[PDB]
Amino acid sequence: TSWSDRLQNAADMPANMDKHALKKYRREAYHRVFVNRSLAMEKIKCFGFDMDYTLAVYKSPEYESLGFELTVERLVSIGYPQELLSFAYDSTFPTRGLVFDTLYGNLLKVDAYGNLLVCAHGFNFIRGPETREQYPNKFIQRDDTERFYILNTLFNLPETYLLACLVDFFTNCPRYTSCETGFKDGDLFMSYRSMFQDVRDAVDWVHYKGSLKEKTVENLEKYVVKDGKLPLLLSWMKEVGKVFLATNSDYKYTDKIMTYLFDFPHGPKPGSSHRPWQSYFDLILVDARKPLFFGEGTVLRQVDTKTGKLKIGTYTGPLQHGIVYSGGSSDTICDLLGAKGKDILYIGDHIFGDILKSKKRQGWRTFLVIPELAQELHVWTDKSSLFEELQSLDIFLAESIQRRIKKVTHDMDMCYGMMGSLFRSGSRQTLFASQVMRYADLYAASFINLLYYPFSYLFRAAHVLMPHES
Amino acid sequence: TSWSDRLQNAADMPANMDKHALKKYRREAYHRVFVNRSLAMEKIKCFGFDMDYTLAVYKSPEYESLGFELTVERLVSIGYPQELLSFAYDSTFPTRGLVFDTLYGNLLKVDAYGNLLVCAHGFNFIRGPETREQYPNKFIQRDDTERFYILNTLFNLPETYLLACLVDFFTNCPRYTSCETGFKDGDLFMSYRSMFQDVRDAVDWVHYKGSLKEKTVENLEKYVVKDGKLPLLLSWMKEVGKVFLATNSDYKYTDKIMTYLFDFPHGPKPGSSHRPWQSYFDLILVDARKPLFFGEGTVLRQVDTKTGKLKIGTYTGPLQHGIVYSGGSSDTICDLLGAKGKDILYIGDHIFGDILKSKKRQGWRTFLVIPELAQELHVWTDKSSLFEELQSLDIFLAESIQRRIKKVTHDMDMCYGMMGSLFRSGSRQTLFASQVMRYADLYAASFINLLYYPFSYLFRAAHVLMPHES
Amino acid sequence: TSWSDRLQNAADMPANMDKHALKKYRREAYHRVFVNRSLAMEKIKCFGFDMDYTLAVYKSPEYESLGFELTVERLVSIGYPQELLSFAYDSTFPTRGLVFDTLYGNLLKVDAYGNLLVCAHGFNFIRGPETREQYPNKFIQRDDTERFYILNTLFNLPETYLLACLVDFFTNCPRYTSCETGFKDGDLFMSYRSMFQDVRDAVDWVHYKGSLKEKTVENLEKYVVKDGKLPLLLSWMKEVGKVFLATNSDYKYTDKIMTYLFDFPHGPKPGSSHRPWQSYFDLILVDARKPLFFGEGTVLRQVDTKTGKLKIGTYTGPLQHGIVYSGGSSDTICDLLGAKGKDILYIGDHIFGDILKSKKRQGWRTFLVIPELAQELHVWTDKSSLFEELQSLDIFLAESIQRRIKKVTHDMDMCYGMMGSLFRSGSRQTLFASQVMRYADLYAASFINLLYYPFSYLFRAAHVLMPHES
Amino acid sequence: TSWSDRLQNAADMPANMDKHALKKYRREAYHRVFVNRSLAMEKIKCFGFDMDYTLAVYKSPEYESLGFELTVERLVSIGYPQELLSFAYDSTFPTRGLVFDTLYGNLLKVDAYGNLLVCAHGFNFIRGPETREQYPNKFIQRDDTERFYILNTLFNLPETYLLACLVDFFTNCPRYTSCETGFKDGDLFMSYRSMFQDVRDAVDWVHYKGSLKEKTVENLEKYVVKDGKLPLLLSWMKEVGKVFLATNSDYKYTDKIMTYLFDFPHGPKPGSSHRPWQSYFDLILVDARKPLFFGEGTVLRQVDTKTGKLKIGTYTGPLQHGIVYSGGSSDTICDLLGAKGKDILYIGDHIFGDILKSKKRQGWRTFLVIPELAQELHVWTDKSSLFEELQSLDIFLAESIQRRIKKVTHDMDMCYGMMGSLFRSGSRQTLFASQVMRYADLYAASFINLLYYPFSYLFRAAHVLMPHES
DSSP: OOHHHHHHHHHHSOOOOOHHHHHHHTTSGGGOOEESSOEEGGGOOEEEEOTBTTTBOBOTTHHHHHHHHHHHHHHHHTTOOGGGGGOOOOTTSOOTTEEEETTTTEEEEEOTTOBEEEEEETTEEOOHHHHHHHOTTSBOOTTOTTTEEEEOSGGGHHHHHHHHHHHHHHHHOTTSEEETTEEEETTEEEEHHHHHHHHHHHHHHHHHTSSHHHHHHTTHHHHBOOOTHHHHHHHHHHHHSEEEEEOSSOHHHHHHHHHHHTOSSSSSSTTSOOOOGGGGOSEEEESOOTTGGGTTOOOEEEEETTTTEEOSSEEOSOOOTTOOEEEOOHHHHHHHHTOOGGGEEEEESOIIIIIIHHHHHHOOEEEEEOTTHHHHHHHHHHTHHHHHHHHHHHHOOOOOOHHHHHHHHHHHHHTTOTTOOSSEETTEEOHHHHHHHHHOSEEESOGGGGGGSOTTOEEOOOOOOOGGGO | OOHHHHHHHHHHSOOOOOHHHHHHHTTSGGGOOEESSOEEGGGOOEEEEOTBTTTBOBOTTHHHHHHHHHHHHHHHHTTOOGGGGGOOOOTTSOOTTEEEETTTTEEEEEOTTOBEEEEEETTEEOOHHHHHHHOTTSBOOTTOTTTEEEEOSGGGHHHHHHHHHHHHHHHHOTTSEEETTEEEETTEEEEHHHHHHHHHHHHHHHHHTSSHHHHHHTTHHHHBOOOTHHHHHHHHHHHHSEEEEEOSSOHHHHHHHHHHHTOSSSSSSTTSOOOOGGGGOSEEEESOOTTGGGTTOOOEEEEETTTTEEOSSEEOSOOOTTOOEEEOOHHHHHHHHTOOGGGEEEEESOIIIIIIHHHHHHOOEEEEEOTTHHHHHHHHHHTHHHHHHHHHHHHOOOOOOHHHHHHHHHHHHHTTOTTOOSSEETTEEOHHHHHHHHHOSEEESOGGGGGGSOTTOEEOOOOOOOGGGO | OOHHHHHHHHHHSOOOOOHHHHHHHTTSGGGOOEESSOEEGGGOOEEEEOTBTTTBOBOTTHHHHHHHHHHHHHHHHTTOOGGGGGOOOOTTSOOTTEEEETTTTEEEEEOTTOBEEEEEETTEEOOHHHHHHHOTTSBOOTTOTTTEEEEOSGGGHHHHHHHHHHHHHHHHOTTSEEETTEEEETTEEEEHHHHHHHHHHHHHHHHHTSSHHHHHHTTHHHHBOOOTHHHHHHHHHHHHSEEEEEOSSOHHHHHHHHHHHTOSSSSSSTTSOOOOGGGGOSEEEESOOTTGGGTTOOOEEEEETTTTEEOSSEEOSOOOTTOOEEEOOHHHHHHHHTOOGGGEEEEESOIIIIIIHHHHHHOOEEEEEOTTHHHHHHHHHHTHHHHHHHHHHHHOOOOOOHHHHHHHHHHHHHTTOTTOOSSEETTEEOHHHHHHHHHOSEEESOGGGGGGSOTTOEEOOOOOOOGGGO | OOHHHHHHHHHHSOOOOOHHHHHHHTTSGGGOOEESSOEEGGGOOEEEEOTBTTTBOBOTTHHHHHHHHHHHHHHHHTTOOGGGGGOOOOTTSOOTTEEEETTTTEEEEEOTTOBEEEEEETTEEOOHHHHHHHOTTSBOOTTOTTTEEEEOSGGGHHHHHHHHHHHHHHHHOTTSEEETTEEEETTEEEEHHHHHHHHHHHHHHHHHTSSHHHHHHTTHHHHBOOOTHHHHHHHHHHHHSEEEEEOSSOHHHHHHHHHHHTOSSSSSSTTSOOOOGGGGOSEEEESOOTTGGGTTOOOEEEEETTTTEEOSSEEOSOOOTTOOEEEOOHHHHHHHHTOOGGGEEEEESOIIIIIIHHHHHHOOEEEEEOTTHHHHHHHHHHTHHHHHHHHHHHHOOOOOOHHHHHHHHHHHHHTTOTTOOSSEETTEEOHHHHHHHHHOSEEESOGGGGGGSOTTOEEOOOOOOOGGGO
16 A cells, blocks of 8 residues: 555545544554644635645656656667666655765665665665765765765656666666776666666656656556545635646646546535535646746746747736736745735645745745655654664664664564655654755645644644753 | 858869969968967967858858748747748848847948947838937947847858848838837736747747758758869968867767868879868867857767767876867867967957957967958959948048938948848948957858968068057 | 853862862852764873863953953944944843854844844844844845855954944934934945954954954963863863864963963972973974864974074975974874774864864864853853743743733843843744854863763763654 | 156156147157057046046056065065065066966966967966967966956066066975976975965055055155146046046045145146145045946945045035045946036056956047057157068968077067067057057057047047958
8 A cells, every 4th residue: 555545545435524523543653744834724814835746746656657668768769778678666665855976876865864774775784884985974965965865755766776787787787887886787887877877868758758757647546636626715815815836847747637636526525516626725836947946047938828838928917816926936926915924824845946945945834745745654653663673773772782673673664665764764863854844844745734733723733842941 | 142152153163273273372361360460370279160051061052041931930849820931031131240239120221339320120221310210329338238239250140130020020010019128918917028039939949949950951052062183281380280179069970070171083183092071180179169169168078889879987188189178268279288278279250259258368379251352352343443432431521411321331231132242231340340359360162262371481471650650 | 240250250260180079069050061063072092182271261341341441442443433442342232153244234133044133233132023124034045245244253252242333323323324224424335344344454464464362462361261170170181181282372472361261370280390391292383273274284484482483495304393383284183193084072162163164174172161151151040940931931832922922031131231142032042052062072161071071081962863763 | 668657757747739830749659659459538528537547647657666665575474484574676577467377377478369479387488389388278267367367557566566577476385396287395285275275365455455556655756656747637627527536545545645746836837826726626535446337337426535534434425625535336426416427537557456447337528648658659650660570471381490589579579578568560450559459449558648629629630441341
């Protein structure tokens, strides 16, 4: 069972709008909203959304596998070897947020300070001592962006696996000689950096010029979670405030996906007239180019919604009914909706490009969707005894049996996958976890979990104290 | 008769290799090589070439008209008005080297110091006094590259005309209101800058993603000058030194064009066996990315000439027979051919990207091909009396009748086209002329003119003296 | 009683080296080391130091007042009005870590997310509603470094006060007209930005070209804390590992200050022979240019310790006894001492330039000295009932009397000074507090507090859990 | 006899204002204005000046020798060896416009294309073949500004000589080992780059913080050319147009120098009342920070001329009598004087910082003062037979005795000095010559030569023709 299986199972449930019944849904950790900083929902006047992996949650592992297959096919078409066609996506390998080291060709899981938690070269997991040869301080400088690329989006899951497949393939194929920074094929030398760049370019190509969008929209039932509670929640938001869409996607793709998401024989609730998806938004903006959107942005354009093309010129007119915007900036949204940053709850999955930047640059309130949480929670609670044991062992130090710490850390981590939990390795939190705590005011497996809280709800987190204050 | 008609007429002539006969060809100014700095041909050990508009001279106005049509069609496809489809390319308007002012939407012909010689807004030629409102010092800062774009390649001729067509169209169409920096269409404002960017992007699109290459290669006889003397000259070069190709074009396009250029029922001379185009080069490099090529370049790759794809990896091996390179840098060429810069004569049409940069960055010797010269010479000699008269009038000043200077300047210029000579307006030299004198050691309407000089020839220019030395 | 009075009082105490007695010193919160992340002291092989406000703690408010006076005198000498000479430093105004807004001339205390906690224009504290006119979202973008300057060093305390004095003076002097971004004096307009730049330049001038160093070294007893336990602790460090100095100061100043710090009629303990300060260090590096030191650094030079001048050339030789280095980089230290980053405990006061950068760029362990903590602890414990009351009030919300929250927040804050605690305003933590927690592994009012812990000590912090893990 | 001896000799001559007599002064090449582009003096409405080496011509070799001595003393004070004190400035070595190669420690004289004309390592002149080892193509990339520094100001003459002295000293002193990129002194390595940087910093120090200004103003008769015709010419300029000063120097230095330049017992002509120097200018601007002045500039300030300090604030008021400006931009001058660029003749010695930039960025007309011309003309005419012979030899080629070309080139060049003419080596023009021709509309040994032409004069240069036009 994947995380999207959980989401789709919860999606198939009709709501019961009884206040006591919605409150009781928050028994299950799966339906909760989690709180890093306090947020009085009564002060939120605008709810903003990203589309991909937020409103449109792509089913796993099917969508990752499609991306993988198309990326492989593109690499083969530009001259990579035919053996790539025998690879098959394996959802049990990648965890999101890994760092590809382009110098040595390793995937690294790191903490918020760049300390190594896991190091794999292809499919070989390198133990601590062997790691010191390449990482003498078991540390990387993660802002050396020429060397390290952080794979922190769900769209990066197929390339996370593909990088490891490629390193493994070239290492074990006798045509190539393994060197410390790449592979030698006679008078050709393929550095891990060049290989990585080829992969990154191919993933981009598949999204922008290849068939990924076309294949997705041909079979939306296969590729996209659909939930009758989406229209209901968005309708309740629009009763208390304004609702907006700000997506990097183009209008044509957005319209196909959103039409599908709202394709039920009813509107917000069963028995109600169906309403077009656009009627749920006070403001619709596509081609947003986030993160640049949260600084200078690009010029504000208007979409000709009959053709899907942009009208010629910068749009200088007012917010009007039926208009669709393209480009612009986060200030556009504030100005057109008459909002200040703290009046906005922005709902998205991109912990950097959206959540971090909207928070740091604009002081927006933030809700982070983490699709994997649906499955990470099941593992966390199910294997709570292992972590409890780890926490007991860490305590038990009067000042060997640190290999029991390593064993239990290994067994815990393997329950999540080969690269472990998104949030930790044993007792050490990942960079991704630290970024979630720092920049996501609220988070959950789905934003639909807001359905289970009233709009006057006060989401509370404990006041933080420094060590000398404690 | 276009400049390419002249080139093709001279192309149809079989050579007579009699030394006296080849020397007598240099009667006609049309067959001469012109000299800005002295060059002892005996010291040249390597001859290097660009392909486009150098080896492969595209026929005019047919190729410009094709580019124009495809660019228009692309703009219409992205949402420009259908009326664009009624435009038709007019070769009598554009002269190469004009500056588009993106603030005010004017085409400007300027001297080497940025002084205005000609200013047109659409198809309205603005007289001197009216020019002062927008250009108070009749001057532009040409290195303000955010505002001014210099249209100095032959590929820029269609967009030169298209910019003027667009300014004219929007000015005279009652749907739009003319403003000083663009056009208002209700709540849309299209700046001249945005319009220019759309045009530039569309020209790029047509070359890289559209059908321009496909349409060219479907009818090479229509679009490309072919000359049996090309193989002959290149064969003579290879007897005295090394020959190389360094082109921005890709291998597949290069191979189609070059195959056509050498498709005769013979090799260098009639009666000789035909030889493949690649046999004429000691070194073949495609995807050169000039001008970057003359600094750091890009990594050296090898072309798989069976597939037209790049082999995977950086190429680390030696110069070998049959290899085709991709990317690299000008140092690659020097190293692989064992040459120093002054041993190289580099032959090309791009007065900036190639000739200027190879000279300034590497000290290569330079030969500039200027296709328009074939027709500019006919006008210069034919209307020599007008210039003579202008030169007499300038002299005749004891220290009105400056309007006779303006009249004669106008009539002279109109013989060349609406934007005048590539090289001057009346007695004032253009920026393009100044750049040719400064960076092209030799220049001519075609590099084939080298056929008429022996390889021991000493091309001589007079020693330059400062005014106080004279 | 200032924070340096506390430090000097604790400095006058002779140590009792009895293990039970040193352990009992850590009763008092004042003598503790506080722990943000666990640190096994047994793994530290190198102890590194900054000098200023770390080894050499300047007495307060005397040193701030000297800096203030000299800065004022410099501004007057370059043409500011004579009335500046009537200002007198007031230690009750500035708190460290404030942000000067150069657009509107305000001092701001902000949280880690840029939310406004306190806003003063000159000496006028602006209440919440009035703050919205200039800060509509009660938020600033703190990385807009062209607009906002963060005053986070102890050397910035005099200019913090001077900025407020200047804004107040120009506002209330009838020669000038107050505008929203500065002051008008007829045909002169002095923006807050220009004024700020003048102040910043004058503070720099006083440190680098003026008399601050000379006046300090003429009366070290007045200006610098001296503690017989310093040599003792450094001697114990050198028994278990290596000790180094890396200071931005020059050799001549360093030697004067360090000579004073070790000028007792004994060495590490009473009865022992006095030893020169240099004998306490395995490596001495001056002119470090931190933070650049933690990236590329500058070339490694050697100090001629007889003249205080640099020897000519880059130093290419080995670590040798008696050598003093200048410039270099953090890698120099690692290489010369044979250390990896995690083997180093770097001890300093500069929460950005040293502690943050050594941690992020190199993975060094960090100990932050916070001189004000000595007094902030006395206030925190003494007025613990007020905070307790605030914490109770925050709890008491069933979901007015938020003005009791504002009242109690005000009274709590005023016990620290006019700009409140370095660490918080009421229940909200400051940016400075957040940076301390994030980047300082350990912190204390003085590094001398390490004297009270054995070198095998395991400093422990609780494992952090995400909200969904709790 | 130095060039300043010539200038001072011509300075001692009283004018005879008889029109026939002033015209006859232009017999002598020494009193002419030379013309690169035509300039109708009748259209010039504003005359602008730099001060140093333009109005205030420093006497040679005395001023160079003072700069040299103070620069040496500064290097010794920061730790260079005492032997530097035995160096003595030698005016027969340096020619202006040489390039210091910081990689190999050579002084190079180059043409406009970076071709090597002369190469000296210390005082060893390297012949052609030996030059190829370090310069394989006898070429440098002169815009590699990290490697090459062009010594093109008269203030650079002392450091030109000092660089050669230092290279010579370290090469021949047995304490140091000569390496290809610097010198080894045990465990110290002094690169030519570091040495160059020390020299450059010391020259800057001497001008900005040392005693050069103080020593100059203590003995102005020794150090500065004074000419009673200066006030006369400036008075005639002010009758036909506006006059301005735009200098990088500060007000205090400017006032000392300018007071001296106008200290005669009369005003413009003998018998007239003396008038203060400021009365000769419609606009006085100091601290100009050229070349930045010709782009964005700095904020406009006003000088308090009683104190020599800046008034506080940006100056927002109008041009008024008696005001002195500081900073600003070239637009300030245009706006305040109501001028367009082509109405301005800007008179200066800095062929880059002023003449090039005012021309390229603003389209100002330009007059370049070249103090050395006064002596270069005497050599050019005196040894005209040698150049004539060189020109004959170059001609005499039917297509050995190229060593006669080298011999005659050597003997010609040696008449100017060890590094030859500022303008050429034999038949090859220098970079400096090419820049003069390209950017100086007019040039002369002194701007005082304008006294010999009426203000209606039409300065004429021949129309330039391309080779194909000839």
